Design a protein around this ligand. Sequence first.
Ligand SMILES: *[C@@H]1O[C@H](CO)[C@@H](O[C@@H]2O[C@H](CO)[C@@H](O[C@@H]3O[C@H](CO)[C@@H](O)[C@H](O[C@H]4O[C@H](CO)[C@@H](O)[C@H](O)[C@@H]4O)[C@@H]3O[C@@H]3OC[C@@H](O)[C@H](O)[C@H]3O)[C@H](O)[C@H]2NC(C)=O)[C@H](O[C@H]2O[C@@H](C)[C@@H](O)[C@@H](O)[C@@H]2O)[C@H]1NC(C)=O
Ligand SMILES: *[C@@H]1O[C@H](CO)[C@@H](O[C@@H]2O[C@H](CO)[C@@H](O)[C@H](O)[C@H]2NC(C)=O)[C@H](O[C@@H]2O[C@@H](C)[C@@H](O)[C@@H](O)[C@@H]2O)[C@H]1NC(C)=O
Ligand SMILES: OC[C@H]1O[C@@H](O[C@H]2[C@H](O)[C@@H](O)[C@H](O)O[C@@H]2CO)[C@H](O)[C@@H](O)[C@H]1O
Ligand SMILES: OC[C@H]1O[C@@H](O[C@H]2[C@H](O)[C@@H](O)[C@H](O)O[C@@H]2CO)[C@H](O)[C@@H](O)[C@H]1O
Ligand SMILES: [Ca+2]
Ligand SMILES: [Ca+2]
Ligand SMILES: [Mn+2]
Ligand SMILES: [Mn+2]
Lengths: 238, 238
Amino acid sequence: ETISFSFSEFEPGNNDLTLQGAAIITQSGVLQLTKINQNGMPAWDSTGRTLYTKPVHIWDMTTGTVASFETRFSFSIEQPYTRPLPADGLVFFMGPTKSKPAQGYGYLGVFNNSKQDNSYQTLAVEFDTFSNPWDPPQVPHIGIDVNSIRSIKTQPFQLDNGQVANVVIKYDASSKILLAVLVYPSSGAIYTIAEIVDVKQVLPEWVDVGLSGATGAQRDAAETHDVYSWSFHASLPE
Amino acid sequence: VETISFSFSEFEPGNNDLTLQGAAIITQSGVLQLTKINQNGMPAWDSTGRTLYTKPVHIWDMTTGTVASFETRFSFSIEQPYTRPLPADGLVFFMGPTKSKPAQGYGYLGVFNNSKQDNSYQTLAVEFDTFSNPWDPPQVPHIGIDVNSIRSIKTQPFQLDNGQVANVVIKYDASSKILLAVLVYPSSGAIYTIAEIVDVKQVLPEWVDVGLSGATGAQRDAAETHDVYSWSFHASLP
Ligand SMILES: *[C@@H]1O[C@H](CO)[C@@H](O[C@@H]2O[C@H](CO)[C@@H](O[C@@H]3O[C@H](CO)[C@@H](O)[C@H](O[C@H]4O[C@H](CO)[C@@H](O)[C@H](O)[C@@H]4O)[C@@H]3O[C@@H]3OC[C@@H](O)[C@H](O)[C@H]3O)[C@H](O)[C@H]2NC(C)=O)[C@H](O[C@H]2O[C@@H](C)[C@@H](O)[C@@H](O)[C@@H]2O)[C@H]1NC(C)=O
Ligand SMILES: *[C@@H]1O[C@H](CO)[C@@H](O[C@@H]2O[C@H](CO)[C@@H](O)[C@H](O)[C@H]2NC(C)=O)[C@H](O[C@@H]2O[C@@H](C)[C@@H](O)[C@@H](O)[C@@H]2O)[C@H]1NC(C)=O
Ligand SMILES: OC[C@H]1O[C@@H](O[C@H]2[C@H](O)[C@@H](O)[C@H](O)O[C@@H]2CO)[C@H](O)[C@@H](O)[C@H]1O
Ligand SMILES: OC[C@H]1O[C@@H](O[C@H]2[C@H](O)[C@@H](O)[C@H](O)O[C@@H]2CO)[C@H](O)[C@@H](O)[C@H]1O
Ligand SMILES: [Ca+2]
Ligand SMILES: [Ca+2]
Ligand SMILES: [Mn+2]
Ligand SMILES: [Mn+2]
């Protein structure tokens, strides 16, 4: 059982994408996850997401088989303000179908608190720009989140302000290895992170896949969270 | 902490920190040509060359059972100038017993002696394979994770960007036992990833040598270049 999609760019109306919160697709084909003010500056106190309309079959209880998958997307985060510190980040997430945006700020529109809760049934790879109490001190950092905003693994990386980053996330069901890579063509910088994740005991049999972004809790604690392309592929062995 | 690291932004003829074996030479221009390049600028077949960092690396300690985490990065280019016969054989990053000499060439890439898996090899390698031997998947080129055998425990096909520079990142996390590798072609923006579980305690000796090896084919024109422009490495033993 296979499923996949590829957006080399986005266009206003694409029935295959559900926009939630402040998320909008510009005429230029850019998915702005968080609000961009009239004057071009990123707005604080903003949360937006996008979900692929079709659900994905990740695993099956009867057969006990698990799907391997991969997703890729390009994004740019620009932190224009001299102060205060920018926030909060963007993230790729997989979880229960028909989900609506959760809490913003450090929860990135995906979680509701900083608890360890198996009921979240969510897996996510974050690109975190603000260090919250539950975070490592280094920001930005990539993070692998399993049923909690408290990453089971993190990797610091240097932002190349306003430049486009290419992300590759892949999950191999056989080894249970979830890996993510971030590349900045502008500088050639490459960052990687990987950890074991048993999706069988984390995600529901069917899930929705999406992208979410959020700006800060105080004036000007913000940055852009723009996405230019997004592709996904999953194959469930029978 | 037991740490070791080196970084060659380019290579200099005479650098006492590198041991050149086989056909390997360092050009005045600072390029490490693993396999012989003829005076007419064309790569010679039946060529095998390697380079080893002169200092041994402490990967693990049997007394305490501690295992080091490490990472290596290098840039290389493989140019296949002939339309016939098929190009061969590839290049590889390998870690194994110190004071080793080039092994069999061709598809064994100067690191192994035959296709059998043998603990006596005590070698871990990440290959960039260009010719499909009987023990290989049909697709070439491909990245391969080699544990005591030229027959990879995991492979990932990738499209060559003929003659262009590829950036490689290989990292081992002792806590998760995850060995990952990434190849990026700035020229096209292509990104490839591969990862698998590897218990280095049961594979490598406490102290190892790290090196790069390249080899061309067993018949005329079954050749390609195996040039390396830079190489860095770092390991941390708790
Ligand atoms: C790929 O294949 C190569 C070549 O076969 C191999 O490298 C050779 O390994 C052999 C070991 O099997 C090396 O030979 C030894 O050399 C030392 C140093 O002089 C001697 O002390 C050894 O003799 C003792 O041990 C013998 C048992 O192995 C025993 O029979 C002797 O009586 C003595 O106690 C041994 O010398 C040989 O002894 C048998 C004689 O008939 C023979 O003429 C004599 O050579 C040999 O030098 C290596 N050759 C080269 C060029 O490297 C690769 O791996 C080996 O690499 C070695 C450097 C070392 O690290 C070995 O542990 C390793 O197995 C093979 N590649 C891999 C990694 O699999
Ligand atoms: C995250 O916060 C959400 C908002 O409160 C929770 O969803 C809400 O779940 C209620 C039932 O638990 C349901 O009545 C509400 O309609 C729904 N949304 C609203 C408007 O409140 C969410 O709850 C989780 O998901 C639901 C579907 C159930 O499975 C709950 O048991 C879950 O807790 C919150 N998620 C978590 C894990 O806290
Ligand atoms: O500053 C960005 C940062 O804000 C945190 O929330 C702060 C808030 O900004 C501050 O004015 C108030 O006094 O305390 C809050 C914390 O309790 C967010 O939590 C963080 O995610 C960022 O958005
Ligand atoms: O052709 C490149 C390819 O050669 C293989 O070796 C061949 C050899 O080329 C051929 O002339 C001979 O008859 O049989 C050999 C075994 O198939 C190498 O094994 C392979 O690695 C490449 O180098
Ligand atoms: Ca955070
Ligand atoms: Ca081969
Ligand atoms: Mn975080
Ligand atoms: Mn191979």
